[PDB]
Ligand binder design. Structure first.
Ligand SMILES: *C(=O)[C@@H]([C@@H]1N=C(C(=O)O)[C@@H](S[C@@H]2CN[C@H](C(=O)N(C)C)C2)[C@@H]1C)[C@@H](C)O
Length: 237
């Protein structure tokens, strides 16, 4: 497992949380206490705040306006769950604008997300600062989501949970959200979520690593599933 991490030149940390103990793995363990921009992983909080404050529903279709977006994959209609797995930023920037800077700021402070700072721009704060979060805060945030213990309505947490559902492996279920912050130096890579194992135990996780332009998109998820197999949390099918 240690040999897996330094097989790359990757500066990475992998955090796990079972509700009582944080475990750290990787090449750079101090990354777990270091704050980084959430990037696309903020969509979890964005979706929670939007649904809790009745600014959107999990069945609403955010239609494309016809203007080309940063990726052509984003040039289509999305629900919030579809936009979550596609990481469709323009759909969640529209959600952030429905929420507004003052409610977004008060809600992120209410739930204690990261450093609870958003600045002035309601559709940019998670992509270039000032909002930052540590990987330990990320594992605990998504672990609380898995248990329905976040300061949100129970049906709201359930809806966002199903928005993160990415794989069923027998009676085991993987929930995850990827992130790549490219508008910061250095670039940050996230892979955050939890596994609902067949025995009933929940294990949250968060990969956090340095990234650069050449990196393959699939590397973060590959690395996380690799480690999860080695940990015994999520064995390959
Ligand atoms: C969020 O961190 C940024 C987005 N995160 C991405 C990522 O984690 O892959 C990409 S999404 C990109 C286009 N859709 C593809 C995809 O996820 N699938 C085909 C499943 C990859 C994007 C950089 C966002 C802030 O730009």
């Amino acid at each position: 497992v240690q040999a897996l991490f330094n097989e790359i030149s990757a500066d990475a940390v992998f955090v796990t949380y079972d509700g009582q103990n944080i475990k750290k793995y990787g090449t750079h363990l101090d990354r777990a206490k270091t704050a980084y921009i959430p990037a696309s992983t903020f969509k979890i909080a964005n979706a929670l705040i939007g649904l809790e404050n009745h600014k959107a529903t999990s069945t609403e279709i955010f239609k494309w306006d016809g203007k080309p977006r940063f990726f052509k994959a984003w040039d289509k209609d999305f629900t919030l769950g579809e936009a979550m797995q596609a990481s469709t930023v323009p759909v969640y920037q529209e959600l952030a604008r429905r929420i507004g800077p003052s409610l977004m700021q008060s809600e992120l402070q209410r739930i204690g997300y990261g450093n609870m700072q958003i600045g002035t721009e309601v559709d940019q704060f998670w992509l270039k600062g000032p909002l930052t979060i540590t990987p330990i805060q990320e594992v605990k945030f998504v672990y609380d989501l898995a248990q329905g213990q976040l300061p949100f309505k129970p049906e709201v947490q359930q809806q966002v949970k199903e928005m993160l559902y990415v794989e069923r492996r027998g009676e085991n279920r993987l929930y995850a959200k990827s992130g790549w912050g490219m508008a910061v130096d250095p670039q940050v890579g996230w892979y955050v979520g939890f596994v609902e194992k067949a025995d009933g135990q929940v294990v949250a996780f968060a990969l956090n690593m340095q990234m650069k332009a050449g990196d393959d998109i699939a590397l973060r998820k590959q690395l996380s599933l690799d480690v999860l197999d080695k940990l015994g949390v999520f064995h390959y099918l």
